[PDB]
Amino acid sequence: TMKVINDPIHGHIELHPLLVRIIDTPQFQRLRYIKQLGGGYYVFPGASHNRFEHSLGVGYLAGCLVHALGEKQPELQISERDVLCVQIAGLCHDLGHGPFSHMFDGRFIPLARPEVKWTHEQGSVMMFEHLINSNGIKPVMEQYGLIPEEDIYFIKEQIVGPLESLWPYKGRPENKSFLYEIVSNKRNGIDVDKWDYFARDCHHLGIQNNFDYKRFIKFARVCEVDNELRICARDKEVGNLYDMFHTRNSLHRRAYQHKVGNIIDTMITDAFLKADDYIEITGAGGKKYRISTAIDDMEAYTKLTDNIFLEILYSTDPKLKDAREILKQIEYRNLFKYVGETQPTGQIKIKREDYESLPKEVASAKPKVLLDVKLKAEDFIVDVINMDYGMQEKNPIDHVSFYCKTAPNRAIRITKNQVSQLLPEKFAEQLIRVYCKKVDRKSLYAARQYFVQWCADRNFTKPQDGDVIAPLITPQKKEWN
Amino acid sequence: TMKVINDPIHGHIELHPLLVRIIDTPQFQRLRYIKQLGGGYYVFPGASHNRFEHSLGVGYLAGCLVHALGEKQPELQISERDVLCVQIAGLCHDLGHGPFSHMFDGRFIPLARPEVKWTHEQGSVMMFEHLINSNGIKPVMEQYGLIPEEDIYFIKEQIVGPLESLWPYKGRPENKSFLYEIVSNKRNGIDVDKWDYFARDCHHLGIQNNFDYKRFIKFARVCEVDNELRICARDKEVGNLYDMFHTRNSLHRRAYQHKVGNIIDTMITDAFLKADDYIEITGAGGKKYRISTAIDDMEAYTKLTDNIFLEILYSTDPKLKDAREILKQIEYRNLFKYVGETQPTGQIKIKREDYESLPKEVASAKPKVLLDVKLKAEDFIVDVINMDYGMQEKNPIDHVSFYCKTAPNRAIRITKNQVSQLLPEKFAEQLIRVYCKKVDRKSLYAARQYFVQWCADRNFTKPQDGDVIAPLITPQKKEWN
Amino acid sequence: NLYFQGSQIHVDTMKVINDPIHGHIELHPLLVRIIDTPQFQRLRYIKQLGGGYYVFPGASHNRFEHSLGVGYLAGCLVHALGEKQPELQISERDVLCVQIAGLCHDLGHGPFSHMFDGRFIPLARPEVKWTHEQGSVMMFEHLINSNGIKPVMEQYGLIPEEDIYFIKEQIVGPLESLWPYKGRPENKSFLYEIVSNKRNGIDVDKWDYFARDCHHLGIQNNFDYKRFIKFARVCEVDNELRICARDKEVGNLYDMFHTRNSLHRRAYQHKVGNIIDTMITDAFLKADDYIEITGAGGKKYRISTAIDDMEAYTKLTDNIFLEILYSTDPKLKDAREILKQIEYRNLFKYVGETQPTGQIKIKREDYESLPKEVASAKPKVLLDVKLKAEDFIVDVINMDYGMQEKNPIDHVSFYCKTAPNRAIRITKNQVSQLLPEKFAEQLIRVYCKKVDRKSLYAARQYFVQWCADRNFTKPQDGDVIAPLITPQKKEWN
Amino acid sequence: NLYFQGSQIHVDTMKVINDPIHGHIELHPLLVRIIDTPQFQRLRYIKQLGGGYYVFPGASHNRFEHSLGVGYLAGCLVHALGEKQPELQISERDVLCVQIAGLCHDLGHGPFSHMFDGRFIPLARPEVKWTHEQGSVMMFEHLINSNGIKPVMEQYGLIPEEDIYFIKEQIVGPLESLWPYKGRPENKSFLYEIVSNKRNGIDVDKWDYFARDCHHLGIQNNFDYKRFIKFARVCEVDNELRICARDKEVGNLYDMFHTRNSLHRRAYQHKVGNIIDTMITDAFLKADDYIEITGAGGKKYRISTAIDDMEAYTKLTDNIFLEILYSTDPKLKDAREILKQIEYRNLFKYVGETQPTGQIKIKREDYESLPKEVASAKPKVLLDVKLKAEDFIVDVINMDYGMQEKNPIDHVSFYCKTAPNRAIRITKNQVSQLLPEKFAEQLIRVYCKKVDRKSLYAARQYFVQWCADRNFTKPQDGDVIAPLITPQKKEWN
Ligand SMILES: Nc1ccn([C@H]2C[C@H](O)[C@@H](COP(=O)(O)OP(=O)(O)OP(=O)(O)O)O2)c(=O)n1
Ligand SMILES: Nc1ccn([C@H]2C[C@H](O)[C@@H](COP(=O)(O)OP(=O)(O)OP(=O)(O)O)O2)c(=O)n1
Ligand SMILES: Nc1ccn([C@H]2C[C@H](O)[C@@H](COP(=O)(O)OP(=O)(O)OP(=O)(O)O)O2)c(=O)n1
Ligand SMILES: [Mg+2]
Ligand SMILES: [Mg+2]
Ligand SMILES: [Mg+2]
Ligand SMILES: [Mg+2]
């Protein structure tokens, strides 16, 4: 039997029994113990929500979109099989997230295991495979009209993109291309994943969402673009699409890259790094794994959630003392201190290979200020944050197809010039934040002098509080006045 | 006694008895019969709200802001007298609006009376004067600690700006400069008027508001800028301020300049123009006025509201037949037809003196298309819409002062470069919309050919549906491909 | 231009409209056709809550947008039932007919909605028995005939004669005189329960106004209609196919009627809103001889007679208030003066409220006599003023769960998880002991038309004395407003 | 750096925090100091609604954010009263003390909130009498002492010994044994009514959870606390200064308790949520001998004994669920296995619900005997299975208006517009006949631990037979789940 579930965002949702079967497994239920916004909860007290409820919402919206397209255009031949496969991909897209979500694959794994290249999406494919195999899902799929081998493949492609390096997909053909655009849209980033998190994150954060996904659904059609049937938006809705990406950027700005939230994520990561040699997680065949190696074994990874934070915090093992001590500083709210923020000026980009060298640069600045303290490279954190419209330097709207009232089956393109002169001139930028691990008044004052001097030396933008935090430094640069 | 009133936007609000006294007059109650968004209601069925409830909200928020500043900074010496005067200005700012709000001073009066230069704000001063004088308000003001002559002057200045063409204000001195920034902020447009309408219009329209005025209040301080005490925002809130103006622009884009809403406003205006010789409104000393002359007599103007639409619609006078007939076409939904939209390309600006000449230009275009119909100048409407951040070409954030965490009493400035490269490169633009009054299939097809040809001739932007609506025209211009 | 299975694909793009309550709604072209008429557009000029706007400044909404929402929800419910139970053979014809009934249910409302058929017409024309629902049938008939709707109906698969009849029945109930309906048979009985549910009052009309009124009033709605839809099925009850709720949702259904009663209490029977409605009605009564409204064939009608001619009635909206307010005719001076007192907020003064005590009911035939009773009371208090019958207004308000003395849940059928096609009944005792023991009551409000402090003080003494004489309940503020009166009644102490 | 009247201006910028319910809240530095401790931060790891999250996927919220909201609202109410009535001489010291009590009221909650002191401790330690409120006092004492709070209190004008006492009294009620309080006198009685109102249950704790729980659950709140604040005054009642509501707000107060009862009904006593709480408790019981928690001086405690040591208790949160779930110790296998059944959604099965009929009350001393009664029933039905006492769970749920059998509105004082300083009482009969006639009741839920279809079918027969034998109410689905049983009882027909 279908179940009805009440979600605060979407209201009363129906879950097909096959979905219920997938949901009621250790692999899916695991997402109840992983916070959507990671350390954000320690800044936004409403942000208590977990990946579980987001995944349900994504599964639901994926079904909503596919159904709506099918009802409007029978000629697409969307089957209930297709609907289920998209719902399942929606449900399972986040299965590979680790403790504190983006903290894990964004901060911890790069530091704990530089030799690997890991993403939560790859994790999701592996965990999905593990969910299917450990819980006897294949016969249940068959029972509801799915073809497991083809459809499992299709689901994985929806999650992670083409699985092999020309129509690059095997699970569905070009005439159902639009099905790959629903859960995770690699072409332009317009997908139901965003739609759920905009609404859900806003509801919990206490920030109001200004994007209307239901309007989008109503104005969506499928049209022939090249040899594919693709989702197209109504032409006059282009402004709303630009606003959609604007909203994503505002949420990143206000909430997801919050300067304190990020420093909490940083501190948690430092603690995990201190604990990683001492915490054991039992995986397949009794083998032991670490926090950093649990990603190599889905049975161990199943048991790796936000609970690791509390295992550390409540530990008595002397070997965990350093890790424990960092988490206690989180609790006492003795956090690393924000120094400032700046950006590059020209066409200038900071390369990732250079990130590690930045704290030394800041330490090596020579502010012409008499200081009671001298600071070292290790005292500074330099966070380089890429802010963009989801496709690096590119305008996603250049990869959207539209239709017009007078010819609803004909796909067209719209350029930036055809829309508005008040839109962004660029679609990517970098923010550079600097923090100091020395928290006393005198270290902080010194840190600000080094930071502003560094901005001056590098021809970066003048920090907003520059004249206040470093009055002796800002005059030297008259690009700044 | 104070009254408590329940407003869906702000909840339970307290009204001081002096405010109640002002509210319970014919001059204020009049605002119950004027729609906030004018013709917008005929496109957005939730937009039934009137100026009355908006004015209450503006009065309330003005008090909220002033109170908050005063509680935080006693050194400002904000009195309850000051609070009342700002509330009253907030309440009374909209008293000068006419039938269908912006339709009246935006479309009707310019056409009905080209020789005058009229604004609703000027109207508000005159109506406020009339409210005070007709209802014995001055003694009531005295009773509550106001000084009528000075304070009435102060209120009018808050509404319309400096009354004489150096500190240009008389009602309050430089040390209370911040009081002029509350209701109608002529310096940068950050005021409580916007805050109420964002929230209220969104609530009724079915579009969600993404600006948080309460956060703004919490981060607001008053600091010395030159010799004035001015409102300053916290430095890191600059992004949110840019978003505030972004929200205003989105609302104008989606709702207030809706292409059909505007055409309904246009049609209502045409009807008023047809009726203007025949409708009589009795003013002071029994004198008769017209719709177009009621602005010269506050007693007549008091009786000029949205009711004029229904007076016309329900009239039987043969002399009102033409006017009545236009309104009936609104009811039957036989509206003028949208042809398209375009913009200028270069540094190019369309001057207001040239607006009237544009329909002739469109009619004089020579599309190389065989047409079954020929159209004249009078068949086209050309609407030129200025979209901007409230200060023409200027960036309002260049006229905002900020403070920093480390020095909260020190005002500073922040440039666009110091914020983000993803922000608008320009702050003003023009939209050009064209409509046709001939509604049959063949006229509309012809109208599109003339329109796109005109865009090509003028080097305007390619209409979004250009290739669809005029496939024979778009190839000639290879700036377009 | 495109083909599938060898046949040209036709793209029929529906109109989309954005409603703040229901979001983006699609309107079938037949609905659009009905909507874009003078008869329907008229509802833009009639406030949903009448005088309520003069108390709740958010309540600016008109009947127009409510009607759209009811039309939309009616379609939603019918669709959902049909999707879950194909065996019902709900057709798109049935869906359209229910949507149209939903849209058109309110066509007969007059100026300020319930003020008109609730207060004005009973006073202006005692000999007639008029209801807005009857008005809606007449206006619907007029809308159809004046706008050439019948061919358009045919074009979309409707059978005009049968279906027009069916729509009218949905609006007003059985039109005659055993299955009492002609538009649809017993196997589609559930279709009559969607727009206006005469059996138990569970319908989409309530669902829209709960959500819409709450949105505008600034009171939060606590009923969830979407949950209800999800738990609704059609089951055989007697020889009819009727809508049934899931058994465990019974608590929520009780709560639904609780919500309706709270909204009536807080908002629709607000003591000041009602007095504004009363004053507007008085003004209309003073204007009724002098205002002319042109109807069919140039005939003149009055405010009170416009209900006899749909062409005149089409032009009778909230505008009549402003026509009066802005008039210069000396003969309208009395009417005008009343409306000006509204603007200056010189309203009749609330005196108090009481209720009957026993199984005691105040009969409607006795309402008119109540102000004299109050005036004839003899309070043992030294007063500066003596008040007459004409100085008092006595408003008797029936508050109930929509079916007089009856529990609506006794007329609801339910189904159980284990046997979803079997209808059952649930009694009050099977649910909760914390529920109401009665389902109807009367509130008696008294007001005074003399507004000075002395008259008001006197009015309170007469009022509380009257409550004592009649063995009514002690007013909540009795000891404060009339300390010398309340001791005489020891049932009160 | 700046001066006014010749004295340097000091700028003390408060911390601002954004809460989705209350928006942007300012936190006094003393509050911040209390918040940023292990004892307070602990509340981040305890779900407000316990097992409710496993039914309502939005209910992910923890006690931490609720506590912040209660602290905030307590300050709001006290401030508002003081602004309107300076004569009360509410000081900023009083305000801080009430805020702190608000913040700290929930410090004593254990894993899954009401599951812990409601289900687990009674079962794990029958000899003790434990409440979360007592826990809160102990944890508050521990928070103060471990974090050097007393000097910080002094720094902001508090008198630690008196004020700490006062805070504890606000949390748990009178600490001893006539004015029963020591922290504040009778003229500040109203201060004890803010956080936890022992007299009638109208407090800010409810106001926060109504709004917060509704936000997360996906059920809309219909109570308006801000309206209440606007209509609240302090008046002399006996020799105390007490909070009084405006008279005409009585209906809204009844509605407030109606809302609380609906939330309990829909969400907090959800039949599946409760069974999840039951299963989690069973798992804790099987784990209790094997889990060690280190407390003061290295001493070891168990889940059931951690309440005896605040240092251990600090480390007892919802984490214990995952410790069990992820354990490999063979001795934890039984506990682990129960939690895995939760994950696989192999829950105990709901059988049905009934209530007592007369003035009949089931006594708590008899609860334990009920499963045997059910098992001893003799249904005249042919069954494949026989069930034992241990196969049944019988949950007896007390539903009431917060004061057992009593009407809380009988313990509320009101004021009237004309005499705002005079307290009065309003009886139920003075309000409405549509209100509850009783204010407390018992719901009896039965579940079966045997989950196969045959056992479930059998369980329903035993259950309905038991209801018949005990003259309980007929289950709502009785005729469907047990058609052969319901005819024997003609009180049911
Ligand atoms: N009055 C109620 C009852 C439940 N819920 C929520 C909790 C769940 O997210 C969803 C489904 O709850 P049900 O109680 O309807 O589901 P069950 O599975 O308990 O009922 P059954 O199995 O008997 O259908 O609705 C709700 O919002 N309001
Ligand atoms: N339960 C209620 C009652 C009223 N209102 C609204 C309508 C008004 O906008 C505001 C004030 O209503 P009151 O009924 O409190 O005001 P009155 O002026 O009628 O009461 P009184 O003069 O007796 O104080 O609150 C409300 O939201 N909820
Ligand atoms: N950005 C927008 C634009 C419009 N609307 C609302 C107003 C109407 O209630 C509904 C439909 O508006 P459209 O602008 O889509 O409809 P038109 O009829 O103007 O467009 P067209 O005829 O070109 O499809 O949506 C909205 O909510 N948001
Ligand atoms: Mg269930
Ligand atoms: Mg009043
Ligand atoms: Mg259109
Ligand atoms: Mg900070």
DSSP B406-468: TEEEEEE---GGGT-TTSBS-SEEEEEEEEES--SHHHHHHHHHHHHHHHHHTT-PPPTTHHH
- Chain A contact for C11 (CB, 8 A cutoff): yes
Same-domain status, C191 and C265: yes
CA distance D462 to chain B (A): 53
- Taking the CA of residue C217 as reference, the ligand 2 atom at the shortest distance is 27
Cβ neighbours of residue B277 closer than 8 Å, sequence gap 6 or more: B290, B319
Measured from the CB, is residue D54 less than 6 Å from ligand 1?
Answer: no
Cα D246 to middle of ligand 2, angstroms: 11
Closest C-alpha to A192, from A64, A307, A325, A298: A64
- Interface mutation target, options C3, C10, C13, C72, chain A, most CBs of A under 10 Å: C13
**Is C48 known to sit in a ligand binding site?**
yes
**Test site for ligand 3: of C16, C36, C72, most ligand atoms within 8 A of the Cβ:** C16
Let me know: does A4 contact A28? Beta carbons within 8 Å.
no
The domain boundary, picked from A334, A357, A386, lies at A334
Residues of D in contact with A44 (CB under 8 A): 18
Please, what's the b/e burial string for C248-268 (b: 16 or more CB within 10 A of its CB; e: otherwise)?
Answer: bbbebbbbbbbbbbbbbbbbb
> Do C255 and C279 lie in a common domain?
yes
SS3 category, A24: coil
Which residues touch B386 (CB under 8 Å, ≥6 apart)?
Answer: B428, B429, B430
**What is the domain extent for residue A205?**
1-334
CB pairs under 8 A between A and B: 115
Residue B338 carries which side chain, given as an amino acid letter?
Answer: Y
Q: Do β-strands C300-301 and C349-354 pair in parallel, antiparallel, or remain unpaired?
A: unpaired
**Residue C120: closest CA among C111, C419, C359:** C111
Task: Measure CA of the first residue to CA of the last residue in chain B; give whole Å.
Answer: 70
> DSSP letters along C243-273, please?
EEEEGGGHHHHHHHHHHHHHHIIIIIT-HHH
Looking at residue A375, what DSSP letter applies? -
Residue D274 annotated as lining a ligand binding site: no
Is residue B61 domain-shared with residue B116, that is, in the same domain? yes
Task: Give the number of domains in chain D.
Answer: 2
Same domain assignment for residues C223 and C148: yes
DSSP summary character for residue B255 = I
Give the three-class secondary structure for A436. strand
Give the minimum alpha-carbon distance from B297 to chain C in angstroms, rounded to a whole number. Answer: 15
Q: Is D1's Cβ below 8 Å from some Cβ in A?
A: no
> Is D166 within 8 Å of D190 (Cβ atoms)?
no
- Residues of chain B with C-beta less than 8 angstroms from the C-beta of A210: 207-210, 247, 250
Question: What's the token pair of residue C488?
Answer: 């005489």
> Domain of A115: which CATH number?
1.10.3210.10
Alpha carbons D487 and D381: distance in angstroms, whole number: 13
Q: Is residue B120 among the annotated active site residues?
A: yes
Q: In this complex, is the C-beta atom of A331 within 8 Å of any C-beta atom belonging to chain D?
A: yes
Neighbours of chain B (3+ CB pairs under 8 A): A, C, D
- Nearest Cα residue to B220 out of B257, B195, B247: B195
Flag if D24 and B405 touch (Cβ within 8 Å).
no
Shortest CA distance from C399: residue in chain D: D434
Contacts of D429 in chain C (CB under 8 A): 357, 473
Query: Does C64 touch chain B if contact means CB atoms closer than 8 Å?
Result: yes
Q: Are C314 and C371 in the same domain? A: no
Find out whether A128 and A91 touch, Cβ atoms under 8 Å.
no
Overall resolution, Å: 2.1
Who lines ligand 2 at CB under 6 A?
B 4-6; C 55-56, 218-219, 266, 271-272; D 252, 417
Q: Which one-letter DSSP state was computed for residue A393?
A: B
**Catalytic residue, candidates D24, D61, D79, D132:** D132
Would you say C448 and C387 are in contact if contact means Cβ atoms under 8 Å apart? yes
Q: Which of A315, A334, A353 is the last residue of a domain?
A: A334
Element (H, E) at A7: strand A3-7
Inform me whether the C-beta atom of residue A149 falls under 8 Å from chain C C-beta atoms.
no
Cα B41 to ligand 2 centre (Å):
28
> For atom 25 of ligand 3, which residue has the closest CA?
C18
Answer whether A469 sits within 8 Å of B406, measured CB to CB: yes
Q: Name the residue facing A11 among C4, C226, C231 (closest C-beta).
A: C226
In this complex, is the C-beta atom of B405 within 8 Å of any C-beta atom belonging to chain D? yes
Q: B-C interface: how many C-beta pairs under 8 angstroms? A: 97
- B230-234 long-range Cβ contacts below 8 angstroms, 24+ apart: B230/B177, B230/B178, B230/B181, B230/B401, B230/B411, B231/B69, B231/B178, B231/B181, B231/B190, B231/B401, B232/B400, B232/B401, B232/B402, B232/B403, B232/B411, B233/B190, B233/B400, B233/B401, B233/B402, B233/B403, B234/B402, B234/B403, B234/B404, B234/B405
Chain C interface, best mutation among D397, D403, D471, D477, by max C CB count within 10 A: D477
* Same structural domain, C334 and C372: no
Distance CA A29, CA A95 (A): 10
- HEC states along chain D? CCEECCEECCCCCCEEEEECCCEEEEECHHHHHHHCCHHHHHHHHCECCHHHHHCCCCCCCEHHHHHHHHHHHHHHHHHHHHHHCHHHCCCHHHHHHHHHHHHHCCCCCCCCCHHHHHHHHHHHCCCCCCCHHHHHHHHHHHHHHHCCHHHHHHHCCCCHHHHHHHHHHHHHCCCCCCCCCCCCCHHHHHHHHCCCCCCCCCCHHHHHHHHHHHHHHCCCCCCCHHHHHHCEEEEEECCEEEEEEEHHHHHHHHHHHHHHHHHHHHHHCCHHHHHHHHHHHHHHHHHCCCCCEECHHHCEECCCCHHHCHHHHCCCCCHHHHHHHCCCCHHHHHHHHHHHHHHCCCCCEEEEEECCCCCCCCCHHHHHHHHHHHHHCCCCCCCCCCCCHHHEEEEEEEEECCECECCHHHHCEEEECCEEEEEECCCHHHCCCCCECCCEEEEEEEEECCCCHHHHHHHHHHHHHHHHHCCCCCCCCHHHHCCCCHHHCCCCC
Q: Which of B16, B49, B120, B130 is catalytic?
A: B120
Q: A110 and A129 share a domain? A: yes
Residues B63 and B49 grouped into a single domain: yes
Asked if A34 contacts A102 with a C-beta cutoff of 8 angstroms, the reply is no
In angstroms, what is the span from residue D88 Cα to ligand 2's centroid? 26
**Dist CA B313 CA C42 (whole Å):** 11
Give the domain-ending residue among C329, C346, C363: C346
* Å from CA of C272 to ligand 5 middle: 8
Does residue A344 sit in the same domain as residue A312? Answer: no
What DSSP designation does A342 have? E
Largest CA distance in chain C: 96
**Are C180 and C110 in contact, with CB atoms under 8 Å apart?**
no
A204 and D CB contact within 8 Å: yes
Q: How far is the CA of B107 from the centre of ligand 6 (A)?
A: 23
Whole-angstrom distance, CA of residue A214 vs CA of residue A195: 9
Is residue D493 less than 8 Å (CB to CB) from chain C?
Answer: no
**Which contiguous run of DSSP H or E holds residue B167?**
none
Closest residue (by CA) to atom 12 of ligand 1? A5
One domain, residues B372 and B455: yes
Q: Which residues in chain B have Cβ-Cβ distances shorter than 8 Å to A467?
A: 412
- Assess A307–D contact: CB distance below 8 Å, yes or no: yes
Mutation pick from A53, A196, A202 vs chain D, by most beta carbons of D within 10 Å, is A53
- Ligand 2: atom nearest CA of C219 is 27
Residue in D18, D38, D319 closest to A307 by CB = D319
Q: Does A24 touch chain C (CB under 8 A)?
A: no
B423 chain-A contacts, CB cut-off 8 A: 424
CA distance D463 to chain A (A): 25
Pocket of ligand 3 (CB under 6 A): A 240, 405; B 43-44, 206-207, 254, 259-260; C 16-18
Consecutive H or E run containing C429:
none
| Shared-domain flag, residues B98 and B146 | yes
Q: In this structure, are D167 and D275 located in the same domain?
A: yes
Question: Which positions in chain D touch C426 (Cβ < 8 Å)?
Answer: 476
Are residues C18 and B203, on separate chains, in Cβ contact within 8 Å? no
Q: How far apart are the first and last CA of chain D?
A: 85
Ligand 7 centre from A43 Cα, in Å? Answer: 9
Cβ pair D181, D174 in contact under 8 A: yes
C-alpha of A80 from chain center: 30
